[PDB]
RNA sequence: CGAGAGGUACUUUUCUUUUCUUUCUUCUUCGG
């Protein structure tokens, strides 16, 4: 729920998180700050590709 | 070519955090030389915990075949700076373009370093 | 090994004792923290950079020291460093059997030449804490 | 050409380390 757009989802057959529609993030650091506030700094690492647009 | 080689192990971090987004002044006491060290290491790029060991070389050159301004690529934290103060239980004061170093140890281990010279800093975490 | 009170080196100054208590009870076991005290320079609105925590047993204290030496206690981007304190927060013996609860205490002196005992008063439901380290 | 009105026009213009004290209940000293 900490993401603004629909970037991360929930897998009902595994009870874990997945990534659906990855080109909808808009680079607002809302889940990285939430993971750092939850004590997991190396949980989600999102980097932009310099050769893909 | 290398005038200083030792095996350091850290003991303290100055911010002592994970995501401070700043530089961390480490405190590393060395084995079999009793030498203290201050160094500003970028933790967010080159991670360093408290308890791990790392080697440290300090050579004025890199190509290891003379030519004072093929290279040494056995390390992972190669830096470069100048030594501006040898004011001494001797202690060095090296600035790597803004990141300060303080290599304080015995006066016999550090004696070949001159004043206002250009020297590198080689590091590898074993 | 004498006391169980542990002093944390660098706690954040924007927290309350409940946030540290829930963090310590989330990393360690449930309700394993007996006492927790953050000293304040002012009366109730300026905590300091360190705090004292007292655990219930020595095994959880050694486990917290092992977690702090391996750098596994990250509380709001702050690596907690444990050390040794000066004294206990509460003078209580760390032993589940030494804390005698709801016992009968009576006073007096031997009256006759035999090993008898005359009681002046009687106290029911008292505590008994045998402090071996403080020798009292 | 003088009077009456409204308007632009001084904006923070000097707060200082942000690290300052609570781990407390502890031998008076000399000579008869």
UniProtKB/Swiss-Prot annotation, chain A:
This is DNA-directed RNA polymerases II, IV and V subunit 3. The gene is NRPB3. It is found in: Nucleus. DNA-dependent RNA polymerase catalyzes the transcription of DNA into RNA using the four ribonucleoside triphosphates as substrates. Component of RNA polymerase II which synthesizes mRNA precursors and many functional non-coding RNAs. Pol II is the central component of the basal RNA polymerase II transcription machinery. It is composed of mobile elements that move relative to each other. NRPB3 is part of the core element with the central large cleft and the clamp element that moves to open and close the cleft. Component of the RNA polymerase II complex consisting of at least 12 subunits. Interacts with SHH1, CLSY1, NRPB11 and NRPD1. Interacts with IYO. Belongs to the archaeal Rpo3/eukaryotic RPB3 RNA polymerase subunit family. The chain holds residues 214 to 266 of 319 of the full protein.
Swiss-Prot record, chain B:
Component of the RNA polymerase II, IV and V complexes. Associates with the mediator complex. The lineage of its organism: Eukaryota, Viridiplantae, Streptophyta, Embryophyta, Tracheophyta. One of its GO terms (cellular component) is RNA polymerase II, core complex. It comes from Arabidopsis thaliana. Pfam families: RNA_pol_Rpb8. This is DNA-directed RNA polymerases II, IV and V subunit 8B. DNA-dependent RNA polymerase catalyzes the transcription of DNA into RNA using the four ribonucleoside triphosphates as substrates. Component of RNA polymerase II which synthesizes mRNA precursors and many functional non-coding RNAs. Pol II is the central component of the basal RNA polymerase II transcription machinery. It is composed of mobile elements that move relative to each other. GO terms for molecular function: DNA-directed RNA polymerase activity. The keyword Flavoprotein does not apply. It is found in: Nucleus. GO terms for biological process: DNA-templated transcription. The keyword DNA repair does not apply. Belongs to the eukaryotic RPB8 RNA polymerase subunit family. Keywords: Nucleus.
Swiss-Prot record, chain C:
Disulfide bonds: none annotated. Transmembrane segments: none annotated. It is found in: Nucleus, Nucleoplasm; Nucleus, Nucleolus; Nucleus. Interacts with NRPD1 and SHH1. Associates with Pol IV complex, forming an interpolymerase channel bridging their active sites, through which the Pol IV-generated transcript is handed over to the RDR2 active site after being backtracked, where it is used as the template for double-stranded RNA (dsRNA) synthesis. Interacts with JMJ24. RDR2 is non-functional in the absence of associated Pol IV. Belongs to the RdRP family. This is RNA-dependent RNA polymerase 2. It comes from Arabidopsis thaliana. The chain holds residues 7 to 142 of 1133 of the full protein.
């Amino acid at each position: 729920e900490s993401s603004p757009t629909k970037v991360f989802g929930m897998d009902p057959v595994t009870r874990q998180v997945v990534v659906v529609d990855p080109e909808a993030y808009t680079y607002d650091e809302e889940v990285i700050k939430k993971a750092e506030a939850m004590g997991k700094p190396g949980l989600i690492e999102i980097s932009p590709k310099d050769d893909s647009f | 070519i290398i005038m200083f080689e030792d095996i350091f192990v850290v003991d303290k971090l100055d911010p002592d955090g994970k995501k401070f987004d700043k530089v961390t002044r480490v405190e590393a006491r060395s084995h079999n030389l009793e030498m203290f060290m201050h160094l500003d290491v970028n933790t967010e790029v080159y991670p360093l915990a408290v308890g791990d060991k790392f080697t440290l070389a300090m050579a004025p050159t890199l190509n290891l075949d003379g030519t004072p301004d093929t290279l040494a690529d056995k390390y992972e934290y190669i830096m470069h700076g100048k030594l501006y103060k040898i004011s001494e239980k001797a202690e060095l004061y090296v600035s790597f373009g803004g990141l300060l170093m303080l290599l304080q140890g015995d006066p016999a281990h550090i004696s070949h370093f001159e004043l206002d010279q250009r020297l590198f800093l080689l590091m590898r975490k074993l | 090994t004498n006391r169980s009170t542990v002093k944390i080196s660098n706690v954040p100054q924007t927290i309350v004792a409940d946030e540290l208590l829930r963090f310590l009870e989330l990393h360690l076991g449930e309700d394993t923290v007996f006492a927790l005290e953050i000293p304040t320079t002012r009366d109730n609105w300026k905590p300091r950079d360190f705090a004292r925590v007292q655990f219930t047993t020595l095994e959880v204290k050694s486990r917290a020291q092992l977690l702090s030496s391996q750098s596994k206690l990250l509380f709001k981007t702050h690596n907690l460093r444990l050390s040794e304190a000066y004294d206990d927060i509460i003078p209580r013996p760390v032993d589940p059997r030494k804390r005698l609860d709801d016992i009968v205490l009576t006073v007096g002196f031997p009256e006759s030449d035999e090993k008898r005992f005359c009681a002046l008063e009687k106290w029911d439901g008292v505590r008994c804490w045998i402090l071996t380290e403080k020798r009292r």
